[PDB]
Amino acid sequence: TFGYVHGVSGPVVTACDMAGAAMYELVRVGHSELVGEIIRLEGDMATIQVYEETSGVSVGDPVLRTGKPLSVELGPGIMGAIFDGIQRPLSDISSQTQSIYIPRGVNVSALSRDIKWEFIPSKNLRVGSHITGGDIYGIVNENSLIKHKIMLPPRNRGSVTYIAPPGNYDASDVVLELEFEGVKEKFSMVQVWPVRQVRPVTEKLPANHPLLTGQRVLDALFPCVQGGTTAIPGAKTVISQSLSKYSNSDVIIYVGCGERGNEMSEVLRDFPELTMEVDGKVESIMKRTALVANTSNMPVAAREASIYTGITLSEYFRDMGYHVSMMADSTSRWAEALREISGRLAEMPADSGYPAYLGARLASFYERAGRVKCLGNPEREGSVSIVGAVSPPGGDFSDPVTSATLGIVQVFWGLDKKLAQRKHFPSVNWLISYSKYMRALDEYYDKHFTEFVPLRTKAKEILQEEEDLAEIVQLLAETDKITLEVAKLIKDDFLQQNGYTPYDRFCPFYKTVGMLSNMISFYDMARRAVETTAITWSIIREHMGEILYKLSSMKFKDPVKDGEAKIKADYAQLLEDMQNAFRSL
Amino acid sequence: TFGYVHGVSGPVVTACDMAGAAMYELVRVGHSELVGEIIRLEGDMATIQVYEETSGVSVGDPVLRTGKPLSVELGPGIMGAIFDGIQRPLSDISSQTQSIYIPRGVNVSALSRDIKWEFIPSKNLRVGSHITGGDIYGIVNENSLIKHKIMLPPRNRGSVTYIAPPGNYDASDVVLELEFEGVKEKFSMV
Amino acid sequence: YLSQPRLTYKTVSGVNGPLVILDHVKFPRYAEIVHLTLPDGTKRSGQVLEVSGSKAVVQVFEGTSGIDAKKTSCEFTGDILRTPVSEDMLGRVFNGSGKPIDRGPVVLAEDFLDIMGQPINPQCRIYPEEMIQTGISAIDGMNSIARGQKIPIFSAAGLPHNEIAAQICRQAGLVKKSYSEENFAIVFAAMGVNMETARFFKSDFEENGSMDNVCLFLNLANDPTIERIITPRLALTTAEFLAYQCEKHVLVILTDMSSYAEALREVSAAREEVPGRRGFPGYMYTDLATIYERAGRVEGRNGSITQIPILTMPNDDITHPIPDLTGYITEGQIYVDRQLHNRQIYPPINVLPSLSRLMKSAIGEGMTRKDHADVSNQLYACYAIGKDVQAMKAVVGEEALTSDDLLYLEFLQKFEKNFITQGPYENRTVYETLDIGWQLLRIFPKEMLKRIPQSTLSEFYP
Amino acid sequence: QAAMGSQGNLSAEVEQATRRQVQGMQSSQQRNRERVLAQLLGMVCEVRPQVHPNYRV
Amino acid sequence: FYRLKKIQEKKKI
């Protein structure tokens, strides 16, 4: 039925004669058909939060009801496309309107109804049988790299009465008929799934395999795990490119909920040009990747819903028997949006203005990652790795967002106190930097690398010893000097990764192992006494200055042109030079 | 008189039909008589900060009105006993229920009743003697060491009209007094 | 009991947030439970929060999503939330509301109880006397836990405290003096935890053959907050039933009550009460007191209850309200230090700032052994001196030290090597810990044992 | 081999223990069915209705 | 705290 707007207050819209409306029922507003959703009920008089500016809307305008809550659209062709926070096809919209501006484009389908993909039914199916459902029933015959296999919506299982033959179809036509109950059914290649629900699964299993990244600091101190969860300061975007490039990531999802506009144009320009070369065939990484753009320009609820939309997409592709590596640009801006909307509702706030349920919502966003066993007759597994970003607030440690985040995230890394070098982006804060996956991965490490096992501990020993003695130095034995100069070298070389240069754009784990082994073996045979083993530190420095320069200049060996063998050989030669210097010391 | 409950929100309770109520006047709420204090007055409505646990309280429950503010009971038997800060005793409630837990509905007397005390009136006081407040008129052997002498409380005075004889009394009346041509008010040792 | 039929309503004035306004209710009760039936056929449950006039507002555990304004219905239990309880609940697992998590059936109601609990008469409290074996050298020798002593543990985020709790649960028990260990039991409660550290508990506690004396509760982070606030009281009540109505000694373990405080903030925000210190209601002190003071022995019974909760300190701040108040209403604390965790010592316990207020009675000759107190005090003092001597060495150099300083340094080193480190499965008996302590003590010569009475030295030192 | 033999033996033992527990349980159920059902039905047929105690005139 | 008290006071209408 129809309604009438009783009042307007910024992005809020009071209305009347809305008896029977649901809690999150979508609704169109005004003659512009602005999209919104129910928030509060007060009898027939309700309140609606809208997704676009309300300027010009008058009193008494029509209000149309719909029968669905917020939902996303699914099917072929999602990969390789770009979407808004409420799943608008930006590219197709700019194509149709042929104008730079975004009009009030209230009617456009997420996936084109004209492009036809070659559907192929599974051979094991037979028409007119009593299979009683099962998920997989067909497959898109080809895309560039990833075949978009098709499944049956959950909660809907039934016998078979007709299956379409092989052929090209536009996804607007029906290929399934699964009556099974005296009530006929029809399904195309397109599904609708509510965003805020959770797609059920058969089972969840513990982590059983690591995750590889290029960054040395993540790989050595706080390794990540496939199917894992992590948070990283937002002080970086190259990490998404690196994990897609090297790690075993099938599909990539990147979501900018509130990024700056220029950086978002930067990403849009640079991302498609990149390539993968899976097996010598140069293939664009965009083919295995989908985007959800949302700058600060868009209204509040677009930013609110971008995260949930992305998580729904990742879950859907997880069900398809793949591995997905998601990264969110930031969570602080989402929290600010929540603050703004809570203040709009005039619901009384908690500390720092944030609504009390912030922790509950952050829990809802998390606890959806992990390795799982999908729901289906064909057995398969899907992994979801979530990499959130906590942009540094003014109160880094005291931010409620950070406090709630540290109560959930399995593995966390953070920046130390803001150093004099504002460009010290690969820092480390030993106060709060930790991991929770050492137990489930040492068995894997033992079969590949074993030298690092005491070295990782010894590095921490050295760093904490320096941290203890530093304040005393500021306000003096030689061994103290050896410790602090080694720690300074470690911070100057092992940390402070560049990223924007090829020689530190990516680093294989073996390069890290070699350079760290050399850098720490420097200390392992220089701390045995004030001498080489049981002079002073100044004597050691004067004796081995060239050694220190070469230790520093390890970093420049580019993996791109220099293979692993050559860099290993150079490091080993430098180690031999260090040994020669030790013998003459 | 009595009242009825109108609303409950945690340790707050707004009750209606409390016309005539007084500030800081104790009250009893619900079938289990939980103890509360008057905080706000508005028309006949009233507000009650109940400090006991609130649960199961329904609308329209009886509200007995206690015609005093928070106070303390006195007399013999005080010494050696245990109190919980609102005069509610502990020794007698461990007995008579044999429960480790304290029931919510506890309203026993602060000082045990049905105990004799061997009251001895003052031998210098006759019927007619004009006395004043805080005036000793008897002596009690609450123990073997210290004598808990009884005295009329302040804000009371005048010509005695009757004195009880020596003997044993179970916390009953002992003195009558008809000052100011009012009533012949009676006073026990409590 | 109740004999009247249950009621159903469809009058729904509106909804605001997680609360639902109804009207035209006859004699509504305060905290009576209700059920909800969405028009699509889903089931839900909730608790009445506030009542005024004929109106009554209700919170919903599973969320208020999808509620229809005119096509929903509700039913009234007409009574306060009660729990089914029984001694056979051992070996089971639940989700806070009592719904089984494993594939077992519903618990038979051997009895019904009120979850809110009751206060305890102070006259019946009996001073704790005995001690509970824990299998950890730090908790048993250097410190102690009596039969009734409420000892929290502080631990900053990201440090291994769940492992300590799990090992304590696995290796819990009583001192074998020569009405045995069968009387001992455990009630474990974890709240607001990740799905990891939950599968870990449910698997590992099964892998070590100990479900015969464990009653476990889990509540993941994504669960309703009202489940979180409800769960610990449920655990405490089942503990009280199993310990007092049936003669048992029960060790309750609580994990991360800071999340319980977060849920308390949630419910406070729902009721629209003005926040105070650090966004916490003032009455949270009395609330935590209600969750505490369910311990100690009682006359006329041979049982006991002992609480060992765990807390997450925000940014190592002792003056934060949570740990400060907890200290105000607890009898000691055990610290966990970051540097020790970085030193790869599996038990990261830093025994220096820790302190137990009831050492003097928990041990003795009738207890584990007579020499225990002397050994503990001497160990503590000489460790303090050893840390001081390492500080001395930091500047004065090794050549400027005496033999005594070398003894202190060597003793310190061997002490963290052996006394502190246990291993994730090494169940040490108390006598074994005392033997290790004596062996370490023997390094120093006879005369330096200033804290040791001479008779004990003659008996044990040789 | 020792482990396998012991495991088989203990499996037989626990199976027999569960079986005899179930059998004794069934016997106890058989001992007391009519009394419980008679009590239940007899007290179910009772109604004894009343108004809410707090109703005022 | 004072701001919050004032907004509640006004909301009581």
Tell me the CATH number at C424.
3.40.50.12240
Alpha carbon distance C242, C246 (integer Å)? 5
Contacts 24+ apart (CB under 8 A), C284-292: C284/C321, C284/C325, C285/C325, C288/C257, C288/C325, C288/C326, C288/C329, C289/C329, C290/C117, C291/C232, C291/C233, C291/C236, C291/C257, C291/C260, C292/C150, C292/C329, C292/C330
Provide the 3-class DSSP secondary structure of residue A568.
helix
Separation of alpha carbons A530 and A522, rounded Å? 14
**Partner D contacted by B56 (CB < 8 A):** no
Binding-face residues of B in 19-78 toward C, CB within 8 A: 53-60
Are the Cβ atoms of D52 and C26 closer than 8 angstroms? yes
CB C133 within 8 A of CB C430: yes
Q: How far is CA A63 from CA A17, A49, A170, A571, C112, in A?
A: 10, 13, 33, 71, 52
- C-alpha C454/C-alpha C105 separation (Å) is 62
Q: For residue A226, what are its two tokens?
A: 């496939």
C342 vs A contacts (CB less than 8 Å): 430, 460-461, 464
Q: Which two tokens stand for residue A278?
A: 């899976």
Q: Determine the Cα–Cα distance for residues A60 and A6; give it in Å rounded to an integer.
A: 7
- Asked if D52 and C27 come within 8 Å (Cβ–Cβ), the reply is yes
Residue type, D12: A
Q: Which DSSP symbol is given to A62? A: E
Tokens for C196, please give them. Answer: 């990891």
Question: Is the Cβ of D57 closer than 8 Å to some Cβ of chain B?
Answer: no
Write down the experimental method used for this entry.
Answer: cryo-EM
Quick one: which of A379, A375, A370, A365 has its CA closest to A204?
A: A370
Number of domains in chain C: 1
Q: Treating both helix axes as pointing N-terminal to C-terminal, what angle do C199-207 and C162-170 enclose, rounded to 10 degrees?
A: 20
Q: Which residues contact A535 (CB under 8 A, 6 or more apart)?
A: A478, A585
Tell me how close the Cα of D37 comes to any Cα of chain C, in angstroms.
18
Taking Cα atoms as reference points, which of A565, A553, A560 lies closest to residue A242?
Answer: A560
- Tell me the CA distances in angstroms from C333 to A361, C189, C296, C310, C327, one per residue in order: 33, 19, 17, 10, 8
Residues of each annotated binding site of A for ATP? 234-237
Q: Which candidate in C121, C124, C230, C305 is best for mutational testing of the B interface (most B CBs within 10 A)?
A: C121
Q: Say what the alpha-carbon torsion angle A342, A343, A346, A348 is, to the nearest 10 degrees.
A: 80
As a whole number of angstroms, the distance between CA B169 and CA B150 comes to 13
CA distance B179 to B185: 9
Contact pairs from chain C to chain E, CB under 8 Å:
8
At position C276, the amino acid (one-letter code) is G
Q: Smallest CA–CA separation between B107 and chain D, in Å?
A: 23
**Residue of C24, C25, C30 to mutate, interface with B, max B Cβ within 10 Å:** C30
Rounded to 10 deg, the angle between the C257-271 and C284-291 helix axes is 130
Ranges assigned E (strand) in A329-412: 372-373, 381-390, 411-412
**Interface size between C and D, measured as CB pairs under 8 A:** 7
Strand partners, C356: C332
CB neighbours of C170 closer than 8 A, spacing ≥ 6?
Answer: C135, C204, C205, C208, C210, C425, C427
Contacts of B38 (CB under 8 A, 6+ apart): B21, B22, B23, B24, B25, B26, B27, B46, B47, B48
* C388: containing domain: 1-462
Q: Which two tokens stand for residue C437?
A: 């302590």
Of residues A73, A410, A366, the one with CA closest to residue A198: A366
Contacts of A527-533 spanning 24+ positions with Cβ under 8 A:
A527/A479, A527/A482, A527/A483, A529/A479, A530/A477, A530/A478, A530/A479, A531/A585, A532/A582, A532/A585
Contact: chain E with chain C (3+ CB pairs below 8 Å): yes
Chain C hits for E1, Cβ within 8 Å:
274-276
Residue A51, H or E segment: none
